[PDB]
């Protein structure tokens, strides 16, 4: 019953270490104006 089904995320592990190192979308910012701790 549904043998070929990618349940667990593939990037999970990859994104796992990435998250640990807080290496996520570090894209720029559009007018901060105080507030929003980054």
């Amino acid at each position: 019953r549904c043998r070929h089904r990618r349940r667990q995320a593939e990037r999970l592990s990859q994104i796992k270490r990435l998250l640990s190192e807080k290496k996520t979308c570090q894209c720029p910012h559009r007018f901060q104006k105080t507030c929003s701790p980054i």
Binding site: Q8, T24, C27
Partner: peptide, 29 residues
């Protein structure tokens, strides 16, 4: 309390830095 595995499974990645973007949640205090 709420599971923190769902969002991860359906996580997205930006198309600029090739990194995994984080959708707005609200707070965490």
């Amino acid at each position: 309390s709420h599971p923190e595995d769902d969002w991860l499974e359906n996580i997205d990645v930006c198309e600029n830095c090739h990194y995994p973007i984080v959708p707005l949640d609200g707070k965490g205090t």
